[PDB]
Write a protein that binds this ligand. Structure first.
Ligand SMILES: *[C@@H]1O[C@H](CO)[C@@H](O[C@@H]2O[C@H](CO)[C@@H](O)[C@H](O)[C@H]2NC(C)=O)[C@H](O)[C@H]1NC(C)=O
Ligand SMILES: *[C@@H]1O[C@H](CO)[C@@H](O[C@@H]2O[C@H](CO)[C@@H](O)[C@H](O)[C@H]2NC(C)=O)[C@H](O)[C@H]1NC(C)=O
Ligand SMILES: *[C@@H]1O[C@H](CO)[C@@H](O[C@@H]2O[C@H](CO)[C@@H](O)[C@H](O)[C@H]2NC(C)=O)[C@H](O)[C@H]1NC(C)=O
Ligand SMILES: *[C@@H]1O[C@H](CO)[C@@H](O[C@@H]2O[C@H](CO)[C@@H](O)[C@H](O)[C@H]2NC(C)=O)[C@H](O)[C@H]1NC(C)=O
Ligand SMILES: *[C@@H]1O[C@H](CO)[C@@H](O[C@@H]2O[C@H](CO)[C@@H](O)[C@H](O)[C@H]2NC(C)=O)[C@H](O)[C@H]1NC(C)=O
Ligand SMILES: *[C@@H]1O[C@H](CO)[C@@H](O[C@@H]2O[C@H](CO)[C@@H](O)[C@H](O)[C@H]2NC(C)=O)[C@H](O)[C@H]1NC(C)=O
Ligand SMILES: *[C@@H]1O[C@H](CO)[C@@H](O)[C@H](O)[C@H]1NC(C)=O
Ligand SMILES: *[C@@H]1O[C@H](CO)[C@@H](O)[C@H](O)[C@H]1NC(C)=O
Lengths: 197, 50, 84, 270
């Protein structure tokens, strides 16, 4: 509501189309090397011998202008089509489901999305998730016990200085280490960084 | 000698053969000339624009 | 002042570095602050405390809503010939 | 198309505003290229730096980290790439807004961040984590339990080092490995060269030079000959502009793909 100039793309598109049409109309007044820019006057002042020459000059000039306008329109249409294909992909992938590709729909981990209309486009509101308030802790890759090495099922080992816990990667929720959430594979003589516990 | 141009005329280190009259590089750009009196070779380059 | 893009008249060079808003060229760019010109700063430089036995686990979260705008169509126009 | 003449300028003045459109198009494509590189590379809010002591569990990133000895602060591979890739008529070349040094700085920041933090710095703030455990997570991502990695750490490190050395040797010795960029440069240069060479065409007049045809005839016939030359040169210029527009659109599509790849494969596992 307060901050303006947040919709630059749509305004630019509208301005480009309007300006192109306006200059196409403006091109009529040009002379193109003829006697006058109005057909009636030259028709009402000369015999057809040179009148046809002047008409030919005007015709070729205006035809070139029309060709240029059509070509520019084609290029702009191609660009708009590419943009709208991207918009359709985002609509299908972030509104009807939860996306996993990084930084496709908002910054941070994607949660969900909402569409809204706009005079010649669409506006996506992306609701995401961002962590904060970090800490330091101390880390080890595996734990020796009775000569065999234990690894975490899902999560990571941490320690606040004296005791060791297992947490998930994206949140701090320490839990006591138990056989349920750890699995064992071989003795601990190859792993670099095992901690006796 | 009837050739009209505009630019800065400076000393040239080219080597025109005795029969040569001037030189050009691309698109009829006369790069070097020899004066009709001193027979000393100079080169032309347009003054700055921007 | 002379720069790789040409020269600037009416602006004074300064030895600071800010994230500028008016690009000039070849890294040099200007801002109003008398108009001044300087070298843009890519951003704040920090050194992460990398080690081999330390991590950084978040303890809280925030939820953010962002926007993005995409055009999808433009006005459909047609043009005659004989009338034009 | 006129080249320091008054009669030619006056005659051109009555053909409308083609040149305003041409200048607008060229300026637009230039600004588009600048924004293109800016959005491709500038992905990080801060500038990270690698710690002085480098012990990444045996992995060796010496040939990709920046070398302070080199004045350009570019790594070995960047130097190889830069060394493996190879004037006044009315046209000018503008310099890019971002110097190659700042591009190198962005690349170094991205690489240091992905070495130390992993994918965490792509969402919030960079989070420290030992490299070996990041690699363990990366195996755990693709369906192989981390139980593998800790029993094959040295072998994996040796394989990675050998692979990077082989890549360096292949780039150093084998040529024609950068055909795409060389082809782009060649296309642009050739188009510019043929546009310049088109200036020597007769186009049906009696000469291809303005001053000689002006200092040889009365104004009434000069009008006709200047008109012929003007229309020919205008047609050539329009063709060149259209070709440039097409090429710029294609390059923009390629850069969009590159930005997508950077966002999806560097800052995270796809
Ligand atoms: C690390 O965390 C553990 C678990 O919270 C702490 O152990 C408890 O600490 C409180 C506060 O000192 C005591 O009242 C409890 O009796 C402790 N429990 C046990 C089983 O000892 C431990 O103090 C923390 N370490 C540090 C350095 O803060
Ligand atoms: C974890 O426990 C093992 C087994 O008790 C320790 O390994 C032996 O420890 C004894 C007593 O400290 C030593 O006399 C042996 O020489 C150790 N054997 C080996 C092969 O090292 C192990 O040291 C403990 N962890 C730590 C960090 O000390
Ligand atoms: C985590 O531990 C480090 C020390 O291992 C603490 O000190 C920081 O160290 C880094 C790199 O040496 C500096 O850039 C920071 O300025 C230091 N912090 C200070 C001096 O307060 C660090 O503070 C601890 N906490 C965090 C969140 O990193
Ligand atoms: C980080 O550095 C090494 C390698 O991971 C380990 O600790 C080193 O162990 C060697 C051999 O016992 C000692 O000589 C070094 O003094 C230790 N510290 C170093 C190299 O910084 C361990 O993984 C980590 N060490 C610490 C202190 O965190
Ligand atoms: C996580 O962040 C939220 C948001 O700041 C914290 O909630 C705030 O708590 C303080 C203390 O009670 C209140 O004064 C604020 O009004 C709360 N914010 C909101 C938006 O309600 C929350 O406490 C943080 N989590 C932890 C564990 O500290
Ligand atoms: C990473 O690889 C580089 C490239 O081989 C190593 O640099 C070599 O180090 C040896 C031993 O000092 C020298 O004899 C070579 O001349 C070096 N090569 C170059 C190109 O400088 C570097 O030592 C490796 N890093 C580690 C930690 O081993
Ligand atoms: C031309 O005349 C001038 C003056 O009479 C003289 O200095 C010069 O040497 C002459 N050049 C030639 C080629 O005879
Ligand atoms: C300050 O700027 C001047 C040029 O304006 C430059 O010569 C000088 O090296 C800069 N630094 C210092 C410390 O003067």
């Amino acid at each position: 509501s307060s901050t303006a100039s947040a919709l630059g793309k749509l305004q630019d598109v509208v301005n480009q189309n309007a300006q192109a049409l306006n200059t196409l109309v403006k091109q009529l007044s040009s002379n193109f090397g003829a006697i006058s820019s109005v057909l009636n006057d030259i028709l009402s002042r000369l015999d057809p011998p040179e009148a046809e020459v002047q008409i030919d000059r005007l015709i070729t000039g205006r035809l070139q202008s029309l060709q240029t306008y059509v070509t520019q329109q084609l290029i702009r249409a191609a660009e708009i089509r590419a943009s709208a294909n991207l918009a359709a992909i985002k609509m299908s992938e972030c509104v009807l489901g939860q996306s996993k590709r990084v930084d496709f729909c908002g910054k941070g981990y994607h949660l969900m999305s909402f569409p809204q209309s706009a005079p010649h486009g669409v506006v996506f509101l992306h609701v995401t998730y961002v962590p904060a308030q970090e800490k330091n802790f101390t880390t080890a890759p595996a734990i020796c016990h009775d000569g065999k090495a234990h690894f975490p099922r899902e999560g990571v080992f941490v320690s606040n200085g004296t005791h060791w816990f297992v947490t998930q990667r994206n949140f701090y929720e320490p839990q006591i280490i138990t056989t349920d959430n750890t699995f064992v594979s071989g003795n601990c003589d190859v792993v670099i960084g095992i901690v006796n516990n | 000698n009837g050739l009209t141009g505009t630019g800065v005329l400076t000393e040239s280190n080219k080597k025109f053969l005795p029969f040569q009259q001037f030189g050009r590089d691309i698109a009829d750009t006369t790069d070097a000339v020899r004066d009709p009196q001193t027979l000393e070779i100079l080169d032309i380059t347009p003054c700055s624009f921007g | 002042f002379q720069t790789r893009a040409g020269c600037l008249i009416g602006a004074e060079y300064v030895n600071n570095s800010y994230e500028c808003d008016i690009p000039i060229g070849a890294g040099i760019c200007a801002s109003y602050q008398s108009i001044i010109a300087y070298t843009m700063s890519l951003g704040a430089e920090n050194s992460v405390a990398y080690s081999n036995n330390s991590i950084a686990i978040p303890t809280n979260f925030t939820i953010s809503v962002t926007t993005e705008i995409l055009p999808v169509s433009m006005t459909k126009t047609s043009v005659d010939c004989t009338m034009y | 198309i006129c080249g320091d003449s008054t009669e030619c300028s006056n005659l051109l003045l009555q053909y409308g505003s083609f040149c305003t459109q041409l200048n607008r198009a060229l300026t637009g494509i230039a600004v588009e290229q600048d924004k293109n590189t800016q959005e491709v590379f500038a992905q990080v809010k801060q500038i990270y730096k690698t710690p002085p002591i480098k012990d990444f569990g045996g992995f060796n990133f010496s040939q990709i980290l920046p070398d302070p000895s080199k004045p350009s602060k570019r790594s070995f591979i960047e130097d190889l790439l830069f060394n493996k890739v190879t004037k006044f008529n009315g046209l000018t070349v503008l310099p890019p807004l971002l110097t190659d040094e700042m591009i190198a700085q962005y690349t170094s920041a991205l690489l240091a961040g992905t070495i130390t933090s992993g994918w965490t710095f792509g969402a919030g703030a960079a989070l420290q984590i030992p490299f070996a455990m990041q690699m363990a997570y990366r195996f755990n991502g693709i369906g192989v339990t981390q139980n593998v990695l800790y029993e094959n750490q040295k072998l994996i490190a040796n394989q990675f080092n050998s692979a990077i050395g082989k890549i360096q040797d292949s780039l150093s010795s084998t040529a024609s490995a950068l055909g795409k960029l060389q082809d782009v440069v060649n296309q642009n240069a050739q188009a510019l060269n043929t546009l310049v060479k088109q200036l020597s065409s007769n186009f049906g007049a009696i000469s291809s030079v303005l001053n000689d045809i002006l200092s040889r005839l009365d104004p009434p016939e000069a009008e006709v000959q200047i008109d012929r030359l003007i229309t020919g040169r205008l047609q050539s210029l329009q063709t060149y502009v259209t070709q440039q527009l097409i090429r710029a659109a294609e390059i923009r599509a390629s850069a969009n793909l590159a930005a997508i790849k950077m966002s999806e494969c560097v800052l995270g596992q796809s």
